[PDB]
Amino acid sequence: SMEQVAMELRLTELTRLLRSVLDQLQDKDPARIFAQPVSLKEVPDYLDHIKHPMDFATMRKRLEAQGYKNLHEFEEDFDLIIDNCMKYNARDTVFYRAAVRLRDQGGVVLRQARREVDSIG
Template sequence: MRLPKTDIDEVQSTLKAVLTKLKAHESAWPFAKPVDAAEVPEYYGHIKFPIDLKTMGDRLKQRYYVHPHLFKADMRRMYHNCCQFNAEDTEYFKAGRALNEYFEQLWTEHGFVA
């Protein structure tokens, strides 16, 4: 991945802006927080590496994302988990696809490449 941004603070700021926009997207609601095991008890038996927008926000605050590819990897994992757990005709799958498409658009708009 070629990254034009070199200042870690600038990268963190940009990732925060991307995450804020993702959280505000109309299709973000299924991904806003971790899946509740009481509501969906089988989820954690199928999904070994869960991720959600809240956890990504926590990771951003902890400066876990020392390189943008880590952020993108979490987004890809979230989408993969969604596709793996939900059928294509569900509102969750459709929301995941829409949010992923929006993410890819934001990623490019904010100057990240591949």
């Protein structure tokens, strides 16, 4: 149908906006602490601690499959990255501190993305 196409065009545009948001959030992680999944070879017990692992490469694969329906789903995944880190790692670690900084700096980006998504529809 013509509607399914219109729908698909919106998703594609949402995907375009979310790709830009993702690049901006990932620039706030210059140390690349959150770039890839936590290695289960290097942290064999990780899944005993963290039930839903997440990282920026995993979000990108979902993004490019147009697997985010709305900003809320995307934000859920970004929040997993942060929240998993802040549980697994103690307060006095470079990892925990990196998550806090990513959260704080990402807020600005996500604030405007919500306004854009509502605005453009």
